[PDB]
Tab-separated table of C-alpha atoms in Angstrom:
chain	number	residue	atom	x	y	z
A	8	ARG	CA	-22.362	36.021	23.975
A	9	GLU	CA	-19.903	38.182	25.809
A	10	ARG	CA	-18.846	34.084	28.349
A	11	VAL	CA	-18.947	32.864	24.467
A	12	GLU	CA	-16.063	34.686	23.966
A	13	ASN	CA	-13.930	34.027	27.341
A	14	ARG	CA	-14.884	30.954	27.158
A	15	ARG	CA	-13.565	31.214	23.002
A	16	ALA	CA	-10.538	32.838	23.933
A	17	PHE	CA	-9.316	30.244	26.976
A	18	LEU	CA	-10.217	28.209	23.870
A	19	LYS	CA	-7.946	29.375	21.474
A	20	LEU	CA	-5.186	30.037	24.233
A	21	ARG	CA	-5.199	26.053	24.822
A	22	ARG	CA	-5.041	24.949	21.092
A	23	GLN	CA	-2.161	27.529	20.229
A	24	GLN	CA	0.023	25.610	23.248
A	25	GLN	CA	-0.934	21.972	21.167
A	26	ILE	CA	0.390	24.507	18.150
A	27	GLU	CA	4.036	24.992	19.976
A	28	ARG	CA	4.332	21.840	21.104
A	29	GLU	CA	3.703	19.886	16.956
A	30	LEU	CA	5.025	22.223	15.162
A	31	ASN	CA	8.014	21.841	17.648
A	32	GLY	CA	7.966	18.068	17.020
A	33	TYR	CA	8.156	18.782	12.632
A	34	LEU	CA	10.769	21.362	13.109
A	35	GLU	CA	12.947	18.777	14.265
A	36	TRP	CA	11.399	16.111	11.630
A	37	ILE	CA	12.934	18.572	9.281
A	38	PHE	CA	15.644	19.324	11.367
A	39	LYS	CA	16.654	15.268	10.707
A	40	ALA	CA	16.595	15.588	6.883
A	41	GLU	CA	18.479	19.018	6.671
A	42	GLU	CA	21.531	16.908	8.755
A	43	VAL	CA	21.505	14.531	6.323
A	44	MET	CA	21.360	16.364	2.950
A	45	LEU	CA	23.833	18.073	4.348
A	46	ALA	CA	25.894	14.743	4.949
A	47	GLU	CA	25.111	14.290	1.759
A	48	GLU	CA	24.947	17.775	-0.786
A	49	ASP	CA	26.725	20.070	1.150
A	50	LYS	CA	23.630	21.704	1.271
A	51	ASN	CA	20.717	23.161	3.298
A	52	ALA	CA	18.471	23.773	0.577
B	14	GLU	CA	-13.041	-49.813	-0.973
B	15	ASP	CA	-12.545	-49.098	-4.730
B	16	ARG	CA	-13.277	-45.767	-3.922
B	17	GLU	CA	-10.704	-45.003	-1.229
B	18	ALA	CA	-7.857	-46.542	-4.076
B	19	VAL	CA	-8.889	-44.118	-6.571
B	20	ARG	CA	-8.653	-40.644	-4.066
B	21	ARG	CA	-6.294	-41.914	-2.498
B	22	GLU	CA	-3.798	-42.395	-5.381
B	23	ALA	CA	-5.039	-38.550	-6.507
B	24	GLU	CA	-4.988	-36.675	-3.671
B	25	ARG	CA	-1.214	-38.566	-3.151
B	26	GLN	CA	-0.674	-36.559	-7.135
B	27	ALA	CA	-1.947	-33.977	-5.809
B	28	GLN	CA	0.377	-33.648	-2.415
B	29	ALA	CA	3.284	-34.513	-4.138
B	30	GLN	CA	2.441	-31.063	-6.622
B	31	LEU	CA	2.255	-28.951	-3.419
B	32	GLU	CA	5.400	-30.426	-1.784
B	33	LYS	CA	7.080	-29.568	-5.275
B	34	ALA	CA	5.450	-26.970	-5.452
B	35	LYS	CA	6.959	-25.642	-2.424
B	36	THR	CA	10.142	-24.306	-3.758
B	37	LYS	CA	9.196	-22.399	-7.036
B	38	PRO	CA	9.594	-19.356	-7.155
B	39	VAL	CA	6.337	-17.172	-7.266
B	40	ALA	CA	5.180	-17.096	-11.085
B	41	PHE	CA	3.341	-14.291	-10.773
B	42	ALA	CA	0.911	-12.299	-8.068
B	43	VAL	CA	-2.790	-11.595	-8.454
B	44	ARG	CA	-4.647	-8.580	-5.951
B	45	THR	CA	-8.380	-10.588	-5.656
B	46	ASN	CA	-12.033	-8.967	-7.157
B	47	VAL	CA	-13.925	-11.225	-5.087
B	48	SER	CA	-13.925	-13.063	-2.004
B	49	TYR	CA	-14.125	-17.186	-1.446
B	50	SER	CA	-14.928	-19.604	0.872
B	51	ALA	CA	-13.385	-23.133	0.518
B	52	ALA	CA	-16.091	-24.232	3.094
B	53	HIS	CA	-18.538	-26.700	1.499
B	54	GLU	CA	-15.970	-27.563	-0.593
B	55	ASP	CA	-15.589	-31.077	-2.273
B	56	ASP	CA	-13.780	-31.152	-5.444
B	57	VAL	CA	-10.158	-29.611	-4.154
B	58	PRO	CA	-7.412	-31.826	-4.878
B	59	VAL	CA	-6.442	-32.440	-1.285
B	60	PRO	CA	-9.136	-31.622	1.232
B	61	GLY	CA	-8.640	-28.898	3.408
B	62	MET	CA	-5.811	-27.470	1.358
B	63	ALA	CA	-8.425	-24.857	-0.173
B	64	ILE	CA	-7.043	-21.131	0.373
B	65	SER	CA	-9.639	-18.935	1.206
B	66	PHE	CA	-9.747	-14.862	0.803
B	67	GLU	CA	-11.432	-11.659	0.642
B	68	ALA	CA	-11.998	-10.189	-1.761
B	69	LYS	CA	-8.860	-6.684	-2.667
B	70	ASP	CA	-6.553	-9.975	-0.796
B	71	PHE	CA	-3.477	-10.450	-2.061
B	72	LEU	CA	-2.553	-13.961	-3.396
B	73	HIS	CA	1.418	-15.454	-4.632
B	74	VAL	CA	0.525	-17.943	-7.785
B	75	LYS	CA	3.227	-20.431	-8.447
B	76	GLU	CA	1.580	-23.235	-10.409
B	77	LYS	CA	-1.434	-24.509	-12.494
B	78	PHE	CA	-2.859	-27.570	-11.367
B	79	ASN	CA	-6.060	-28.063	-13.414
B	80	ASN	CA	-8.214	-25.790	-15.161
B	81	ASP	CA	-9.775	-25.853	-11.224
B	82	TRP	CA	-7.086	-24.863	-9.667
B	83	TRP	CA	-3.732	-22.864	-9.204
B	84	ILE	CA	-1.118	-23.508	-6.609
B	85	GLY	CA	-0.046	-20.945	-4.338
B	86	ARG	CA	-0.039	-18.980	-1.226
B	87	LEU	CA	-2.499	-16.427	-0.059
B	88	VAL	CA	-0.238	-13.110	1.145
B	89	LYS	CA	-1.168	-13.115	4.724
B	90	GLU	CA	1.506	-14.018	7.543
B	91	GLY	CA	1.551	-17.887	8.712
B	92	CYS	CA	-0.273	-19.167	5.935
B	93	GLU	CA	1.301	-21.606	3.698
B	94	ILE	CA	1.109	-23.293	-0.042
B	95	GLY	CA	-2.314	-24.793	-1.002
B	96	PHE	CA	-4.610	-24.948	-3.926
B	97	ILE	CA	-6.958	-21.447	-5.474
B	98	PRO	CA	-9.501	-22.133	-7.360
B	99	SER	CA	-8.841	-20.436	-11.224
B	100	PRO	CA	-10.966	-18.076	-12.534
B	101	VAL	CA	-13.285	-20.322	-14.466
B	102	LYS	CA	-14.130	-21.414	-11.475
B	103	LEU	CA	-15.601	-18.703	-9.676
B	104	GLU	CA	-16.942	-17.498	-12.718
B	105	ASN	CA	-18.702	-20.484	-12.448
B	106	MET	CA	-19.533	-19.495	-8.896
B	107	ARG	CA	-20.065	-16.242	-9.680
B	108	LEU	CA	-23.646	-17.550	-11.951
B	109	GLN	CA	-24.644	-19.943	-9.588
B	110	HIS	CA	-24.605	-17.357	-7.169
B	111	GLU	CA	-27.257	-15.427	-9.378
B	112	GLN	CA	-29.401	-17.791	-10.799
B	113	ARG	CA	-29.943	-18.324	-6.985
B	114	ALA	CA	-30.511	-14.925	-6.401
B	115	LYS	CA	-32.563	-14.146	-8.754
B	116	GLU	CA	-34.969	-17.104	-7.637
B	117	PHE	CA	-36.568	-14.355	-5.321
B	118	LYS	CA	-40.711	-13.169	-5.618
B	119	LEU	CA	-40.529	-15.599	-4.247
B	135	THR	CA	-15.294	-8.120	-13.204
B	136	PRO	CA	-12.234	-10.662	-13.587
B	137	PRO	CA	-11.848	-12.115	-10.075
B	138	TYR	CA	-8.335	-11.475	-10.187
B	139	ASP	CA	-6.121	-8.540	-11.378
B	140	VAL	CA	-2.533	-9.048	-11.640
B	141	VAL	CA	-0.128	-6.852	-9.379
B	142	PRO	CA	3.530	-6.635	-8.075
B	143	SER	CA	4.855	-9.679	-6.434
B	144	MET	CA	5.554	-7.024	-3.669
B	145	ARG	CA	3.518	-3.940	-2.687
B	146	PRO	CA	5.022	-0.786	-4.209
B	147	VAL	CA	5.091	1.531	-1.115
B	148	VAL	CA	4.211	5.633	-2.118
B	149	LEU	CA	4.603	8.610	0.405
B	150	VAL	CA	1.923	11.461	0.210
B	151	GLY	CA	1.488	14.639	1.757
B	152	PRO	CA	1.688	16.322	4.676
B	153	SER	CA	0.656	18.698	0.421
B	154	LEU	CA	2.726	18.979	-2.873
B	155	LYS	CA	6.497	17.154	-4.098
B	156	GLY	CA	8.402	19.661	-4.917
B	157	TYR	CA	8.516	22.030	-1.732
B	158	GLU	CA	10.534	22.613	1.257
B	159	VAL	CA	8.144	20.813	3.124
B	160	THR	CA	6.934	17.521	1.977
B	161	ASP	CA	10.109	16.761	0.137
B	162	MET	CA	12.006	16.870	3.273
B	163	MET	CA	9.430	15.346	5.313
B	164	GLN	CA	10.036	12.217	2.671
B	165	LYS	CA	13.299	12.498	2.850
B	166	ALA	CA	13.820	11.738	6.184
B	167	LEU	CA	11.316	8.313	6.168
B	168	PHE	CA	12.967	7.110	3.027
B	169	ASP	CA	16.287	7.583	4.534
B	170	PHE	CA	15.166	5.839	7.755
B	171	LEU	CA	14.321	2.597	5.732
B	172	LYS	CA	17.447	2.555	3.920
B	173	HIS	CA	19.145	1.823	7.513
B	174	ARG	CA	15.787	-0.277	8.891
B	175	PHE	CA	15.381	-2.784	5.843
B	176	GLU	CA	18.984	-2.582	4.600
B	177	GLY	CA	19.489	-5.161	2.303
B	178	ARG	CA	15.860	-6.486	2.416
B	179	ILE	CA	15.024	-3.303	0.070
B	180	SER	CA	14.917	-1.264	-3.525
B	181	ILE	CA	13.441	2.626	-3.229
B	182	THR	CA	13.832	4.139	-6.594
B	183	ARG	CA	13.006	7.088	-7.937
B	184	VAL	CA	10.184	8.005	-10.688
B	185	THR	CA	10.073	10.793	-12.211
B	186	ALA	CA	7.434	9.332	-14.613
B	187	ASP	CA	3.698	9.958	-14.726
B	188	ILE	CA	2.629	6.704	-13.707
B	189	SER	CA	-0.923	8.122	-13.376
B	190	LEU	CA	-1.285	7.870	-16.881
B	191	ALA	CA	-0.919	4.004	-16.945
B	192	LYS	CA	-4.466	3.468	-16.743
B	193	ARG	CA	-6.578	1.214	-19.813
B	194	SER	CA	-8.687	4.369	-20.404
B	195	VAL	CA	-5.131	6.597	-20.993
B	196	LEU	CA	-3.325	3.344	-22.572
B	197	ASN	CA	-5.881	1.558	-24.561
B	198	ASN	CA	-7.624	4.469	-26.507
B	212	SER	CA	4.909	11.929	-20.186
B	213	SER	CA	5.007	9.689	-22.847
B	214	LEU	CA	2.914	6.438	-22.329
B	215	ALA	CA	5.939	4.986	-23.723
B	216	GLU	CA	7.834	5.397	-20.887
B	217	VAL	CA	5.374	5.706	-18.539
B	218	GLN	CA	4.468	1.570	-19.047
B	219	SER	CA	7.778	1.044	-19.188
B	220	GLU	CA	7.907	2.361	-15.864
B	221	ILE	CA	4.623	0.416	-14.742
B	222	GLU	CA	7.147	-2.903	-16.180
B	223	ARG	CA	10.473	-1.839	-14.270
B	224	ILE	CA	8.675	-1.941	-11.050
B	225	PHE	CA	7.378	-5.395	-11.505
B	226	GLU	CA	10.570	-6.290	-12.086
B	227	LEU	CA	11.524	-4.516	-9.260
B	228	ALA	CA	9.468	-6.997	-6.574
B	229	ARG	CA	10.497	-10.075	-9.064
B	230	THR	CA	13.090	-10.197	-6.451
B	231	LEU	CA	10.495	-10.243	-3.275
B	232	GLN	CA	12.454	-7.493	-1.175
B	233	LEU	CA	9.865	-4.316	-0.130
B	234	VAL	CA	9.863	-1.845	-3.106
B	235	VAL	CA	9.206	1.586	-2.321
B	236	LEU	CA	8.887	4.184	-4.881
B	237	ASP	CA	9.595	8.291	-4.748
B	238	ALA	CA	7.145	8.774	-7.341
B	239	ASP	CA	7.182	12.456	-8.479
B	240	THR	CA	3.623	13.243	-10.142
B	241	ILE	CA	1.951	11.508	-7.552
B	242	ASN	CA	0.478	12.858	-5.040
B	243	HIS	CA	-2.669	11.814	-4.345
B	244	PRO	CA	-4.270	7.942	-3.659
B	245	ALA	CA	-7.088	8.291	-6.771
B	246	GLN	CA	-3.757	9.206	-9.115
B	247	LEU	CA	-2.355	5.286	-8.766
B	248	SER	CA	-6.449	2.782	-7.697
B	249	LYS	CA	-7.069	3.115	-11.504
B	250	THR	CA	-3.512	1.157	-12.624
B	251	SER	CA	-2.110	-2.106	-11.944
B	252	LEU	CA	0.568	-1.540	-9.377
B	253	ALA	CA	-2.112	-1.373	-6.021
B	254	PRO	CA	0.626	0.443	-4.170
B	255	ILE	CA	1.025	0.427	-0.108
B	256	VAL	CA	-0.123	4.290	0.362
B	257	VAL	CA	1.380	6.218	3.401
B	258	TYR	CA	-0.362	9.437	4.673
B	259	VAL	CA	2.252	11.764	5.901
B	260	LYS	CA	-0.279	13.976	7.364
B	261	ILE	CA	0.715	16.793	9.130
B	262	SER	CA	-2.934	16.947	11.288
B	263	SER	CA	-3.273	21.173	12.471
B	264	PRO	CA	-3.511	23.620	9.385
B	265	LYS	CA	-2.150	26.269	11.302
B	266	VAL	CA	1.036	24.085	12.366
B	267	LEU	CA	1.755	22.911	8.440
B	268	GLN	CA	1.422	26.631	7.409
B	269	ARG	CA	4.327	27.900	10.823
B	270	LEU	CA	6.204	24.690	8.794
B	271	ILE	CA	6.081	26.448	5.803
B	272	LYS	CA	7.099	29.854	6.395
B	273	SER	CA	10.002	28.434	8.013
B	274	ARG	CA	11.538	27.549	5.225
B	275	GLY	CA	12.271	31.107	4.260
B	276	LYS	CA	10.445	33.789	1.407
B	277	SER	CA	10.138	31.141	-1.463
B	278	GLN	CA	8.955	29.092	0.075
B	279	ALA	CA	5.716	30.918	1.743
B	280	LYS	CA	5.571	32.702	-1.402
B	281	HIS	CA	3.805	29.244	-2.211
B	282	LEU	CA	2.193	28.971	1.205
B	283	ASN	CA	-2.100	29.162	-0.699
B	284	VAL	CA	-1.216	25.870	-3.163
B	285	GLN	CA	0.256	23.841	-0.547
B	286	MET	CA	-2.523	24.610	2.119
B	287	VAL	CA	-5.498	23.540	-0.617
B	288	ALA	CA	-3.209	20.493	-1.225
B	289	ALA	CA	-2.940	19.481	2.439
B	290	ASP	CA	-6.670	20.422	2.392
B	291	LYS	CA	-7.289	18.184	0.022
B	292	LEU	CA	-5.575	15.457	1.113
B	293	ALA	CA	-7.182	15.580	4.965
B	294	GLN	CA	-10.543	15.090	3.407
B	295	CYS	CA	-10.134	11.579	1.785
B	296	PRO	CA	-11.557	8.407	4.141
B	297	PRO	CA	-8.823	6.412	5.252
B	298	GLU	CA	-9.696	3.833	3.935
B	299	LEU	CA	-7.944	5.288	1.160
B	300	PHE	CA	-4.741	5.057	2.924
B	301	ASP	CA	-2.892	1.418	4.156
B	302	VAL	CA	-0.704	3.519	6.851
B	303	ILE	CA	-1.364	7.132	8.327
B	304	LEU	CA	1.356	8.290	9.772
B	305	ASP	CA	0.013	11.274	11.913
B	306	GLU	CA	2.833	11.642	14.753
B	307	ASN	CA	4.600	14.954	15.273
B	308	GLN	CA	7.429	13.235	16.483
B	309	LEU	CA	9.633	11.739	13.771
B	310	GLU	CA	10.765	8.602	15.510
B	311	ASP	CA	7.718	7.766	15.846
B	312	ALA	CA	6.376	8.338	12.621
B	313	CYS	CA	9.123	6.216	11.977
B	314	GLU	CA	8.190	3.336	14.398
B	315	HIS	CA	4.851	3.207	12.355
B	316	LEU	CA	6.223	2.289	9.528
B	317	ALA	CA	8.796	-0.081	9.979
B	318	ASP	CA	5.957	-1.539	12.551
B	319	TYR	CA	3.352	-1.904	9.280
B	320	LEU	CA	6.270	-3.059	7.077
B	321	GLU	CA	7.706	-5.706	9.520
B	322	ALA	CA	4.698	-7.467	9.125
B	323	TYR	CA	3.785	-6.908	5.535
B	324	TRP	CA	7.531	-8.563	5.048
B	325	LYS	CA	6.726	-11.110	7.220
B	326	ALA	CA	3.424	-11.937	5.490
B	327	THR	CA	5.203	-12.499	1.620
B	328	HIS	CA	8.400	-14.789	3.306
B	329	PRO	CA	6.816	-18.042	4.626
B	330	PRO	CA	9.129	-20.324	6.398
């Protein structure tokens, strides 16, 4: 009950850390598209 | 003795046909609705040269031999030209199987499809919004280079989800049907065909058409990750956060069998290599030595 929340906080911490790592991958992905949009259209949109 | 000479003559003529057919272009392709095993076959023009297949396989048809048999090849790496049972032959087998089945007390077999299955991208959310448009653009850009000289990438603005019998036999439908023909024609070259289809956000949308797409799911596994990507594109995009979250959740509810390729890697290079590996295999399947 209490230790549920303690355990839940740790699970939320672990998950939040994986989220930052995944998010970094996808931002780099989008930057690649942005880079070519700039090369072709002179736009980042 | 006067049975070998008759068989030998008939099979020499059949064999000469197969060889002549090798250098002909694909007349048309079909997707199979039934399976067929040439085990305990006995009437194939050349023994051992009948082509077996599972349902939902793809065949390239080069020629007709007689009313029981066409000439062509299974679209599978390594597979060579041989005899393909005509639909009337397969029908005689479906009723034969039926008579047997009702002894216990005790759909057309082929659909005509493009010679190259067109590649369609869906996800991670709705097209017309930045996160989806840009992630898919990176993939299109990669393909133009990796398969340069071997690929056709064309935009399709028409709503090709309308191209089914319940609509056609009862976006303007003229335009839609025109686009379907354009896509069949593009695939005749046997180049890889890639569609940037504006209106297609879900595999169900093309399942009742004759396009038989290769459906590639660009999947962001994490909802929180998608939410933060959308917000990273600024106020205008973030204002439409909910509708994009809904659409992505909808896609993620789909069984994986609805897709041919699921790109859930979060590194662009890994997604690209996963996709190229699939398409390289398909290229080999459609182009034998």
